[PDB]
Design a protein around this motif. Structure first.
Motif, PDB file in Angstrom:
ATOM      1  N   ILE A  66       0.822  -1.211   0.000  1.00 38.15           N
ATOM      2  CA  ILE A  66       0.000   0.000   0.000  1.00 38.15           C
ATOM      3  C   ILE A  66       0.856   1.262   0.000  1.00 38.15           C
ATOM      4  O   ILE A  66       0.596   2.160  -0.818  1.00 38.15           O
ATOM      5  CB  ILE A  66      -0.995  -0.036   1.170  1.00 38.15           C
ATOM      6  N   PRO A  67       1.867   1.406   0.863  1.00 38.69           N
ATOM      7  CA  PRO A  67       2.646   2.654   0.890  1.00 38.69           C
ATOM      8  C   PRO A  67       3.726   2.651  -0.181  1.00 38.69           C
ATOM      9  O   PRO A  67       4.559   1.743  -0.237  1.00 38.69           O
ATOM     10  CB  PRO A  67       3.248   2.661   2.300  1.00 38.69           C
ATOM     11  N   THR A  68       3.710   3.674  -1.035  1.00 37.68           N
ATOM     12  CA  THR A  68       4.709   3.839  -2.082  1.00 37.68           C
ATOM     13  C   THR A  68       5.633   5.025  -1.858  1.00 37.68           C
ATOM     14  O   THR A  68       6.784   4.985  -2.297  1.00 37.68           O
ATOM     15  CB  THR A  68       4.027   4.000  -3.448  1.00 37.68           C
ATOM     16  N   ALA A  69       5.159   6.074  -1.188  1.00 34.18           N
ATOM     17  CA  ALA A  69       5.982   7.250  -0.917  1.00 34.18           C
ATOM     18  C   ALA A  69       5.427   7.941   0.316  1.00 34.18           C
ATOM     19  O   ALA A  69       4.257   8.340   0.324  1.00 34.18           O
ATOM     20  CB  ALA A  69       5.996   8.199  -2.113  1.00 34.18           C
ATOM     21  N   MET A  70       6.254   8.086   1.346  1.00 33.90           N
ATOM     22  CA  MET A  70       5.836   8.667   2.614  1.00 33.90           C
ATOM     23  C   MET A  70       6.347  10.097   2.721  1.00 33.90           C
ATOM     24  O   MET A  70       7.545  10.349   2.557  1.00 33.90           O
ATOM     25  CB  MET A  70       6.352   7.829   3.784  1.00 33.90           C
ATOM     26  N   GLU A  71       5.432  11.028   2.994  1.00 34.50           N
ATOM     27  CA  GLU A  71       5.770  12.440   3.166  1.00 34.50           C
ATOM     28  C   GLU A  71       5.883  12.727   4.661  1.00 34.50           C
ATOM     29  O   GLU A  71       4.985  13.287   5.290  1.00 34.50           O
ATOM     30  CB  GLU A  71       4.726  13.327   2.491  1.00 34.50           C
ATOM     31  N   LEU A  72       7.019  12.326   5.235  1.00 31.96           N
ATOM     32  CA  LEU A  72       7.247  12.571   6.654  1.00 31.96           C
ATOM     33  C   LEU A  72       7.427  14.055   6.946  1.00 31.96           C
ATOM     34  O   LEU A  72       7.120  14.508   8.055  1.00 31.96           O
ATOM     35  CB  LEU A  72       8.469  11.789   7.134  1.00 31.96           C
ATOM     36  N   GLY A  73       7.914  14.821   5.975  1.00 31.57           N
ATOM     37  CA  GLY A  73       8.109  16.243   6.202  1.00 31.57           C
ATOM     38  C   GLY A  73       9.057  16.480   7.359  1.00 31.57           C
ATOM     39  O   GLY A  73      10.141  15.893   7.437  1.00 31.57           O
ATOM     40  N   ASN A  74       8.646  17.351   8.277  1.00 34.80           N
ATOM     41  CA  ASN A  74       9.451  17.696   9.441  1.00 34.80           C
ATOM     42  C   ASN A  74       9.062  16.793  10.605  1.00 34.80           C
ATOM     43  O   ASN A  74       7.898  16.772  11.018  1.00 34.80           O
ATOM     44  CB  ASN A  74       9.255  19.165   9.810  1.00 34.80           C
ATOM     45  N   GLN A  79       6.538   9.632  15.964  1.00 36.89           N
ATOM     46  CA  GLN A  79       5.423   9.338  15.076  1.00 36.89           C
ATOM     47  C   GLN A  79       5.293   7.834  14.872  1.00 36.89           C
ATOM     48  O   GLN A  79       6.280   7.095  14.908  1.00 36.89           O
ATOM     49  CB  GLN A  79       5.599  10.027  13.722  1.00 36.89           C
ATOM     50  N   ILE A  80       4.057   7.388  14.664  1.00 38.78           N
ATOM     51  CA  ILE A  80       3.744   5.984  14.423  1.00 38.78           C
ATOM     52  C   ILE A  80       2.891   5.900  13.165  1.00 38.78           C
ATOM     53  O   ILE A  80       1.908   6.635  13.029  1.00 38.78           O
ATOM     54  CB  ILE A  80       3.008   5.349  15.619  1.00 38.78           C
ATOM     55  N   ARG A  81       3.267   5.009  12.252  1.00 40.12           N
ATOM     56  CA  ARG A  81       2.541   4.818  11.007  1.00 40.12           C
ATOM     57  C   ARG A  81       2.270   3.338  10.785  1.00 40.12           C
ATOM     58  O   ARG A  81       3.015   2.486  11.281  1.00 40.12           O
ATOM     59  CB  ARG A  81       3.325   5.379   9.811  1.00 40.12           C
ATOM     60  N   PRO A  82       1.207   3.000  10.057  1.00 37.92           N
ATOM     61  CA  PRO A  82       0.910   1.593   9.785  1.00 37.92           C
ATOM     62  C   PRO A  82       1.492   1.102   8.470  1.00 37.92           C
ATOM     63  O   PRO A  82       1.490   1.796   7.451  1.00 37.92           O
ATOM     64  CB  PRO A  82      -0.624   1.581   9.739  1.00 37.92           C
ATOM     65  N   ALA A  83       1.995  -0.130   8.509  1.00 37.44           N
ATOM     66  CA  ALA A  83       2.471  -0.830   7.324  1.00 37.44           C
ATOM     67  C   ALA A  83       1.812  -2.199   7.280  1.00 37.44           C
ATOM     68  O   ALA A  83       1.892  -2.958   8.251  1.00 37.44           O
ATOM     69  CB  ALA A  83       3.996  -0.971   7.328  1.00 37.44           C
ATOM     70  N   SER A  84       1.166  -2.514   6.159  1.00 33.58           N
ATOM     71  CA  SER A  84       0.434  -3.761   6.018  1.00 33.58           C
ATOM     72  C   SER A  84       0.751  -4.399   4.675  1.00 33.58           C
ATOM     73  O   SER A  84       1.035  -3.711   3.691  1.00 33.58           O
ATOM     74  CB  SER A  84      -1.081  -3.543   6.142  1.00 33.58           C
ATOM     75  N   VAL A  85       0.700  -5.727   4.651  1.00 31.38           N
ATOM     76  CA  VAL A  85       0.917  -6.513   3.442  1.00 31.38           C
ATOM     77  C   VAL A  85      -0.109  -7.637   3.425  1.00 31.38           C
ATOM     78  O   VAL A  85      -0.300  -8.323   4.436  1.00 31.38           O
ATOM     79  CB  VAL A  85       2.352  -7.076   3.380  1.00 31.38           C
ATOM     80  N   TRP A  86      -0.768  -7.827   2.284  1.00 32.55           N
ATOM     81  CA  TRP A  86      -1.818  -8.835   2.129  1.00 32.55           C
ATOM     82  C   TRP A  86      -1.338  -9.902   1.151  1.00 32.55           C
ATOM     83  O   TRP A  86      -1.104  -9.617  -0.027  1.00 32.55           O
ATOM     84  CB  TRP A  86      -3.118  -8.202   1.642  1.00 32.55           C
ATOM     85  N   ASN A  87      -1.211 -11.133   1.639  1.00 35.85           N
ATOM     86  CA  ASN A  87      -0.827 -12.261   0.799  1.00 35.85           C
ATOM     87  C   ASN A  87      -2.070 -13.051   0.404  1.00 35.85           C
ATOM     88  O   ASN A  87      -2.796 -13.547   1.273  1.00 35.85           O
ATOM     89  CB  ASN A  87       0.162 -13.159   1.536  1.00 35.85           C
ATOM     90  N   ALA A  88      -2.313 -13.169  -0.900  1.00 39.88           N
ATOM     91  CA  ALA A  88      -3.437 -13.938  -1.417  1.00 39.88           C
ATOM     92  C   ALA A  88      -3.043 -15.329  -1.890  1.00 39.88           C
ATOM     93  O   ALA A  88      -3.906 -16.069  -2.372  1.00 39.88           O
ATOM     94  CB  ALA A  88      -4.114 -13.184  -2.564  1.00 39.88           C
ATOM     95  N   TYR A  89      -1.772 -15.705  -1.772  1.00 39.71           N
ATOM     96  CA  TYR A  89      -1.382 -17.063  -2.110  1.00 39.71           C
ATOM     97  C   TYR A  89      -2.085 -18.061  -1.197  1.00 39.71           C
ATOM     98  O   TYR A  89      -2.340 -17.800  -0.018  1.00 39.71           O
ATOM     99  CB  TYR A  89       0.130 -17.256  -1.985  1.00 39.71           C
ATOM    100  N   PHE A  90      -2.399 -19.224  -1.764  1.00 38.71           N
ATOM    101  CA  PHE A  90      -2.900 -20.333  -0.968  1.00 38.71           C
ATOM    102  C   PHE A  90      -1.832 -20.902  -0.043  1.00 38.71           C
ATOM    103  O   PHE A  90      -2.160 -21.702   0.841  1.00 38.71           O
ATOM    104  CB  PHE A  90      -3.439 -21.434  -1.885  1.00 38.71           C
ATOM    105  N   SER A  91      -0.573 -20.511  -0.227  1.00 34.76           N
ATOM    106  CA  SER A  91       0.528 -20.870   0.650  1.00 34.76           C
ATOM    107  C   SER A  91       1.274 -19.610   1.064  1.00 34.76           C
ATOM    108  O   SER A  91       1.339 -18.645   0.297  1.00 34.76           O
ATOM    109  CB  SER A  91       1.498 -21.838  -0.041  1.00 34.76           C
ATOM    110  N   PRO A  92       1.850 -19.587   2.268  1.00 30.56           N
ATOM    111  CA  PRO A  92       2.508 -18.362   2.737  1.00 30.56           C
ATOM    112  C   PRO A  92       3.701 -17.976   1.873  1.00 30.56           C
ATOM    113  O   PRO A  92       4.378 -18.824   1.289  1.00 30.56           O
ATOM    114  CB  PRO A  92       2.950 -18.717   4.162  1.00 30.56           C
ATOM    115  N   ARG A  93       3.944 -16.669   1.798  1.00 31.37           N
ATOM    116  CA  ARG A  93       5.143 -16.107   1.179  1.00 31.37           C
ATOM    117  C   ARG A  93       6.006 -15.547   2.306  1.00 31.37           C
ATOM    118  O   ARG A  93       5.729 -14.468   2.835  1.00 31.37           O
ATOM    119  CB  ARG A  93       4.788 -15.029   0.160  1.00 31.37           C
ATOM    120  N   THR A  94       7.050 -16.287   2.670  1.00 35.00           N
ATOM    121  CA  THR A  94       7.897 -15.905   3.790  1.00 35.00           C
ATOM    122  C   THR A  94       8.896 -14.840   3.356  1.00 35.00           C
ATOM    123  O   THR A  94       9.565 -14.982   2.328  1.00 35.00           O
ATOM    124  CB  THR A  94       8.635 -17.125   4.340  1.00 35.00           C
ATOM    125  N   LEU A  95       8.994 -13.772   4.145  1.00 37.83           N
ATOM    126  CA  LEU A  95       9.950 -12.711   3.862  1.00 37.83           C
ATOM    127  C   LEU A  95      11.356 -13.188   4.201  1.00 37.83           C
ATOM    128  O   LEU A  95      11.603 -13.679   5.308  1.00 37.83           O
ATOM    129  CB  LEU A  95       9.595 -11.458   4.659  1.00 37.83           C
TER     130      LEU A  95
END
Length: 113
Positions: A66-74, A79-95
């Protein structure tokens, strides 16, 4: 009878936050379509070949970013921001790993390795 339609370059490279859609089936060929029975239907089976596809297999079977470019500015406070990843494979994709470069001072809490 029927073997393959294709559409491998389009969908895989298309405007999809996923990819490798309907890819596992390609190697998983199998096939027993040939054959007809007579439930007093009429029985009219001609050609029976492959062609085209849904053409809209979009956004199927892998992670999301979802996040492609973050404008943290100053930045002046914690600060706390959310990062999420959705895997639709029928089997897990391990990082494989998160190679942190110049990311010192950035930590994820409540998550395992």
């Amino acid at each position: 009878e029927g073997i393959v339609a294709g559409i491998t370059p389009n969908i895989d490279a298309l405007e999809l936050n996923q990819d490798i859609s309907l890819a596992a089936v390609a190697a998983s060929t199998w096939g027993g379509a040939y054959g007809a029975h007579q439930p007093v239907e009429v029985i009219h089976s001609t050609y029976q070949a492959v062609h085209q596809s849904a053409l809209e297999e979009n956004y199927y079977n892998r992670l999301w970013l979802i996040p492609t470019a973050m404008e943290l500015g100053n930045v002046v406070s914690t600060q706390i921001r959310p990062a999420s990843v959705w895997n639709a494979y029928f089997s897990p994709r391990t990082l494989t790993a998160i190679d942190r470069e110049a990311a010192d001072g950035i930590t994820l809490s409540g998550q395992a390795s």
